[PDB]
Write a protein that binds this ligand. Structure first.
Ligand code: AMP
Ligand code: SF4
Length: 214
């Protein structure tokens, strides 16, 4: 009742992908803000960040202060990740939303067995990450992700702007064309907060039981 129609969203995603071909991340964020601004938590587009660094958060706040950003609090997070989330909420001009599943960790352990991540990690991710993310994305017309094509060989064709079929709405990846050197230089130039575990030999940060230890 507060999202654009699916054909309208598909046409908007097509036009955005065609017009923003080879554009910078700030240009894509400006286009997203101009297209989904009104009709500062009265915004119609949200940003998703795993709280590994405040690059995308800083960019979105510089293009749109008070922008909302969601963080999927699966309950299995590192204490450093929650600390980084709180620090980003305090420093940057961003409205943070802690998306939590309807069932806590103890409730899920009681209902389907303790340590579901060990027995069915796909179902654990679907219950604590995918379903709450979908329930939160209802009402927004577009979402912004910090996905980079260098994350995996299967992500090499990650589109700049597209229509996410899983959640059925516009998906924008400003950091797609970015490389490791690019994010490094940006981190340097803007003095943006970084999760402390990244310094302690952790390329990617996720849930504590499902993160590869060095
Ligand atoms: N726990 C999370 N909480 C909030 N956003 C996330 C989370 N995980 C991934 N995202 C989104 O997914 C991107 C990275 O995906 P991945 O390659 O699975 O780590 C991030 O830049 C965000 O756009
Ligand atoms: S990363 Fe592991 S603990 Fe976190 S939701 Fe997915 S399966 Fe569960």
């Amino acid at each position: 009742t507060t999202r654009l129609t699916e054909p309208q969203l598909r046409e908007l995603a097509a036009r955005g992908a065609a017009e923003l071909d080879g554009a910078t991340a700030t240009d894509m964020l400006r286009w997203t803000d101009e297209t989904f601004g009104d009709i500062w938590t009265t915004c119609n587009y949200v940003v998703a960040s795993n709280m590994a660094d405040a690059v995308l958060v800083d960019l979105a706040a510089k293009v749109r202060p008070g922008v909302p950003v969601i963080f999927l609090d699966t309950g299995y997070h590192f204490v450093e990740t929650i600390g980084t989330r709180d620090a980003i909420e305090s420093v940057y001009d961003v409205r943070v939303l802690n998306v939590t599943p309807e069932h806590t960790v103890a409730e899920q352990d009681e209902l389907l067995g303790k340590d579901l991540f060990a027995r069915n990690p796909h179902e654990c991710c679907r219950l604590r990450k995918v379903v709450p993310l979908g329930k939160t994305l209802r009402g927004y017309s577009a979402w912004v992700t910090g996905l980079r094509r260098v994350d995996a060989p299967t992500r090499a064709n990650a589109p700049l702007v597209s229509f996410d079929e899983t959640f059925k709405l516009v998906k924008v990846n400003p950091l797609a064309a970015w490389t490791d050197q690019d994010v490094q230089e940006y981190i340097a130039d803007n003095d943006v907060l970084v999760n402390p575990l990244v310094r302690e030999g952790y390329p990617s940060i996720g849930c504590a039981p499902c993160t590869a230890k060095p």
